[PDB]
Amino acid sequence: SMLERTINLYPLTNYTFGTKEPLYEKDSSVAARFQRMREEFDKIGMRRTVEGVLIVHEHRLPHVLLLQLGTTFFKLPGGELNPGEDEVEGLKRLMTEILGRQDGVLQDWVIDDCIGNWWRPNFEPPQYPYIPAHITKPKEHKKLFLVQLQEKALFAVPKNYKLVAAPLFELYDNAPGYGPIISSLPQLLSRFNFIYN
Amino acid sequence: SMLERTINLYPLTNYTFGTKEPLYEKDSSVAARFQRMREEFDKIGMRRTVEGVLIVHEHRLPHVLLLQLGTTFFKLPGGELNPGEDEVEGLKRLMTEILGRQDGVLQDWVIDDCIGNWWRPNFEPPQYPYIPAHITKPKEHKKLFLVQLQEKALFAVPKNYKLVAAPLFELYDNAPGYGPIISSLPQLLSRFNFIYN
Ligand SMILES: C[C@@]1(Cc2cn(-c3ccccc3)nn2)NC(=O)CC1=O
Ligand SMILES: C[C@@]1(Cc2cn(-c3ccccc3)nn2)NC(=O)CC1=O
Ligand SMILES: [Zn+2]
Ligand SMILES: [Zn+2]
Ligand SMILES: [Zn+2]
Ligand SMILES: [Zn+2]
């Protein structure tokens, strides 16, 4: 009856958060964001994005690491794949670009579990955990993965972002605060057997 | 990068829904339900419940089988474990009790995946996908499993219930209609690679 995946969690104090240069968004506004999505869709079709869920604990309470753009939006570490790029190799590349060290030592990213899929039917904000009715050409497909951290690590956070450890209760039923993907992480993580090391 | 579990789905017209005698609830009201939960907690501690998610398709659109008590509440097939009872053997027993055949031929239930965990902190309706802060003695633990159906089957539905195939869009963000567990099935199912046979 042990059908659950077992995942090792480590204290937040096991991890060192250094700083490095700002990492600027491609798009300077929502309007530019949807213009670029439309231009690239006509060239190379559906956008493929990947996002990593990194979990720690303090005193046996799990927390998800989120990246806050100044004091505005909360984001998962991740981003856009290149055409023909493998999903796992691409998430590892993107997580190195975002949290990789100034001294250029490699993190050992371990990615073994898909935890969800979201689809964007139009060049507009709405996203769903399925392809909606009558939609033959979705504009974006987003894939979420659970990233198993090592016991200790040094991460370099771009100076324009703050790394924040969010407890699950703060995410739960808070789409206004976090939107529909991050707010449903508590439900998506409930199947795992966490070990509090 | 194929980290997803692959699941075979079959058309709803592949399945025959017969009828059998009513199957009556132990508790004739919410108030009796929480009285029995309190009496049993003092004798044998935390209630352990198990629930099965059974998926079909029509024209390549997935649907979850729900059991409607007349025209009131929607339920997953499942129920309460006995003390010392294995979770998987118990869900198989409960699904036979509910949907098992009048002719007494065994269904071949295949249960290979946990899809979530919910906890009830008090003798009250609220349930969460984690144990809330300061709660040392939760009153109920509910475990959800994905049940892989065979290509064809005959199910006997108790005359007091109706079997309904709900498309995912109807569940999504509809807790008033379905409550917080069934309404989050779209998110919990998004990680699977469904084959539409
Ligand atoms: C190509 C790339 C790479 C990229 C990802 N991020 C980022 C994502 C999460 C957290 C912090 C930073 N910043 N640039 N540039 C964009 O504007 C979107 C995108 O995918
Ligand atoms: C012991 C038992 C068994 C049981 C389960 N169900 C049922 C569950 C889902 C759908 C249709 C029927 N009806 N009786 N009696 C109760 O009143 C709760 C319980 O667990
Ligand atoms: Zn401690
Ligand atoms: Zn897709
Ligand atoms: Zn068809
Ligand atoms: Zn428990």
Q: How far is Cα A10 from Cα A16, in angstroms, rounded to an integer? A: 13
Residue of the CA atom closest to atom 12 of ligand 1: A98
Q: How far is Cα A185 from Cα B190, in angstroms, rounded to an integer? A: 13
Provide the strand spans (E) within chain B: 6-9, 15-20, 47-58, 61-69, 74-75, 78-80, 110-120, 140-148, 153-158, 161-167, 193-196
From A25, A72, A91, give the residue whose CB has the most ligand 1 atoms within 8 Å, as the site to mutate. A25
Distances in Å between the alpha carbon of A113 and those of A80, B167, B175?
A: 19, 26, 27
Amino acid symbol at B28: S
Q: How far is Cα B192 from Cα B91, in angstroms, rounded to an integer? A: 21
Tokens (6 digits) for B129: 């996908």
Distances in Å between the alpha carbon of A60 and those of A9, A12, A167, A169, A197?
A: 9, 11, 11, 14, 8
Residue B147 CB neighbour total at 10 angstroms: 22
Q: How far is Cα A124 from Cα B49, in angstroms, rounded to an integer? A: 41
């079997």: which residue's tokens?
A: B163
- Any ligand 2 atom below 6 A from CB of B59: no
Q: How far apart are the first and last CA of chain B?
A: 24
**CA-wise closest residue to A135 among A115, A145, A120:** A120
Give resolution, Å, one decimal.
1.8
What number of residues does chain B have? 197
- Taking CB atoms within 8 Å and a gap of at least 24, the contacts of A80-85 are A80/A47, A80/A48, A80/A49, A81/A48, A81/A49, A81/A50, A83/A44
Distances in Å between the alpha carbon of B7 and those of A35, A112, B54?
A: 37, 18, 11
- Tell me the backbone φ, ψ of residue A33, rounded to 5 degrees: -60, -50
CATH number of the domain bearing residue B21: 3.90.79.10
**CA-wise closest residue to B98 among B146, B145, B66:** B66
Cβ within 8 Å, pair A187-B129: yes
Residue B157 CB neighbour total at 10 angstroms: 16
Cβ within 8 Å, pair B3-A169: no
Residue B149 half-sphere exposure, CB side, CA atoms within 13 Å?
A: 27
- Any ligand 1 atom below 6 A from CB of A23: yes
Find all residues with CB under 8 Å of B73, minimum gap 6, and list them. Answer: none
Distances in Å between the alpha carbon of A131 and those of A64, A142, B30, B54, B98?
A: 27, 12, 37, 20, 32
From B94, B95, B145, B162, give the residue whose CB has the most ligand 2 atoms within 8 Å, as the site to mutate. B94
- The total number of structural domains that make up chain B: 1
Q: How far is Cα A28 from Cα B157, in angstroms, rounded to an integer? A: 57
**Contact (CB, 8 A) for B132 and B119:** yes
Tokens (6 digits) for A84: 């023909």
Cβ–Cβ contact A24 with B under 8 A: no
User: Coil, strand, or helix at residue B90?
Assistant: helix
For residue A168, give the H/E element and its range. Answer: helix A168-171
The C-alpha angle with vertex B91 and arms to B34 and B172, in degrees rounded to 5, equals 75
Cβ–Cβ contact A126 with B under 8 A: no
Find all residues with CB under 8 Å of A195, minimum gap 6, and list them. Answer: A6, A7, A8, A9
């006995």: which residue's tokens?
A: B82
> Residue A196: nearest ligand to its CA?
3
The C-alpha angle with vertex B142 and arms to B75 and B2, in degrees rounded to 5, equals 90
Cβ-in-10-Å burial (0-12, 13-18, 19+) of B187 comes to buried
Distances in Å between the alpha carbon of A70 and those of A67, A94, A154, A174, B57?
A: 9, 20, 21, 20, 45
Helices and strands per DSSP (H, E), number in chain B: 5, 11
Tokens (6 digits) for B46: 């935390």
- Tell me the backbone φ, ψ of residue A72, rounded to 5 degrees: -100, -125
Q: How far is Cα B12 from Cα B21, in angstroms, rounded to an integer? A: 23
Cβ–Cβ contact A153 with B under 8 A: no
Size of interface A-B (CB pairs under 8 A): 85
Tokens (6 digits) for A167: 């407890």
Residue A66 CB neighbour total at 10 angstroms: 22
Cβ within 8 Å, pair A186-B1: no
State the pairing for strand pair A140-148/A110-120.
antiparallel
Residue A88 CB neighbour total at 10 angstroms: 18
Residue A43 half-sphere exposure, CB side, CA atoms within 13 Å?
A: 9
Cβ within 8 Å, pair A87-B1: yes
- Any ligand 1 atom below 6 A from CB of A36: no
Interface test with A, best of B9, B130, B182, B194 (most A CBs within 10 A): B130
For residue A65, give the H/E element and its range. Answer: strand A61-69
Domain span including residue A126: 5-197
